[PDB]
């Protein structure tokens, strides 16, 4: 959980193990943070800005006979 503060607004970034934020989990976080937020201040919940990094690698190997799928 990362909490970012602005004057008159609070935004909460959350994520699961996968980096995702389901709508159901978002609703749960909102309902749990109804008791927590200050009075007269606005609270918002958003997913974490996930960044999926694609990695194509070329691995040089010594033992040519051990080259295989495993």
């Amino acid at each position: 959980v990362y909490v970012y503060e602005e004057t008159g607004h609070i935004t909460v970034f959350a994520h699961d193990r996968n980096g995702n934020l389901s709508d159901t989990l978002k609703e749960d976080i909102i309902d749990a943070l109804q008791d927590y937020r200050p009075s007269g201040i606005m609270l918002d919940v958003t997913g974490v800005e996930k960044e999926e990094v694609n990695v194509s690698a070329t691995v040089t190997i010594s033992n040519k006979s051990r080259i295989g799928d495993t």
């Binding site: 602005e6 004057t7 008159g8 607004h9 606005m42």
Partner: protein, 60 residues
Amino acid sequence: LLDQTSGVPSYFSKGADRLEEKMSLTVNDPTSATIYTFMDGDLYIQSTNAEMDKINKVLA
């Protein structure tokens, strides 16, 4: 341009933008609206009073 009622930066302070149209003087740009014409540093044509192209075309 922020909200005058609050008078401080905030999440709700920002609002509409403004279109600003400043005027600048040119020398020989054809796209600009010509106001004067000169020949060897001398004024070419005068106009003592208001200029109205369509009116003057009618009057001519």
